[PDB]
Amino acid sequence: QRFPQRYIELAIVVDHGMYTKYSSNFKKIRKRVHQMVSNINEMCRPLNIAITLALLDVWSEKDFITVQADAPTTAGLFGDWRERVLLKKKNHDHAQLLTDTNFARNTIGWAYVGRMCDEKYSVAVVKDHSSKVFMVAVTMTHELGHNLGMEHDDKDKCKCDTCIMSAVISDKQSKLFSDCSKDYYQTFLTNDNPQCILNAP
Numbered sequence: 001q002r003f004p005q006r007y008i009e010l011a012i013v014v015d016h017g018m019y020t021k022y023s024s025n026f027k028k029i030r031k032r033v034h035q036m037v038s039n040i041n042e043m044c045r046p047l048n049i050a051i052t053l054a055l056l057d058v059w060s061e062k063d064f065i066t067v068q069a070d071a072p073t074t075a076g077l078f079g080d081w082r083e084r085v086l087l088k089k090k091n092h093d094h095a096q097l098l099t100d101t102n103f104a105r106n107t108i109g110w111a112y113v114g115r116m117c118d119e120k121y122s123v124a125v126v127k128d129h130s131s132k133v134f135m136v137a138v139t140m141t142h143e144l145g146h147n148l149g150m151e152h153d154d155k156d157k158c159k160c161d162t163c164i165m166s167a168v169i170s171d172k173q174s175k176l177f178s179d180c181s182k183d184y185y186q187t188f189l190t191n192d193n194p195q196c197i198l199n200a201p
Contacts, residue, residue, distance in 0.1 A: 001048040002182065003189070006197040008044075008116075008144070009054035010037065011086055011095035013078070015067050016059045018128050021100045029058055032133065033098070039137035040144065043164060043175050047185055052201055054092040071103045071110035071125050079112075079120040087119060093196045094122045094147060096140055103127055108169065111143035113151070117194035122147060138164060138173050145181060149188030153180045 012033050022029050033056055041051040064085070065077040074097070082095045094116060103110075103125075111124035124143035128136055145165050152167040153160060162170055163178035177185075 003048040003185065006049045007200050008049055008051050008094055008197055009092045009201060010051060011055040011057065011082070011090070011092040012037070012053060013086070013095060013097045014058045015097060015099045016061070016063045017067065017100040018098055019058055019060050021128065024060065026058055026060065030056060035133045036137040036140060039134055040141050043138065043141045043177070047177060047182070054201070055086070055090045057086065067099050067101050069101065069104040071107045075110050075112065075123060075125045078125055079123045082123055083120045093117055094144065096124045096126055096143065098126055098128050100128050109139040109143045111146045113146045114149035114188060114192065116147045117196035135169070135173065138175065139169065145177070148185055149192065150181045150184040153178045
């Protein structure tokens with residue numbers, strides 16, 4: 001393998017709007033979240049990262065944070081709640097909030113760059129913006145990529161046009177990480193090397 005074995009234990013939180021969107025059907029939601037995780041796991045296979053779902057939390061009654069239009073603001077509130085509440089329920093490495101919120105600036109996903117394992121900043125927020133599971137899962141993977149220290153693909157650095165870290169998603173979206181992405185991940189493992197992803201479940 002090009003990379004050493006790593007493990008990311010995910011917590012996925014489905015907010016109340018998304019719960020309502022799927023007819024308040026917990027089983028339907030769980031199936032969809034599992035299908036998303038299976039895609040994230042497949043996309044990280046070439047990075048030698050095993051992706052597991054450590055925790056699924058569905059906000060079936062009400063939202064515990066204000067899931068607002070500005071994605072960065074929502075991500076900060078989510079990180080706070082993840083550190084204060086979710087991590088106390090079950091340990092995990094990274095958490096993503098799935099929502100049906102129409103985020104400002106036509107945003108479908110957002111995450112902090114290079115903060116994997118951080119108690120508050122190892123998070124992403126993702127809009128359930130397509131009926132196609134893969135389109136949402138690749139957005140979750142793109143945000144995970146940012147959290148693993150990846151920036152967008154740049155044509156001078158690598159040639160892939162439709163890879164996961166492309167600057168904009170497309171209908172022809174690939175499930176592959178570009179060489180720009182792999183090089184950023186190598187830099188991240190060399191310079192940051194966060195301990196939580198070294199630990200297998």
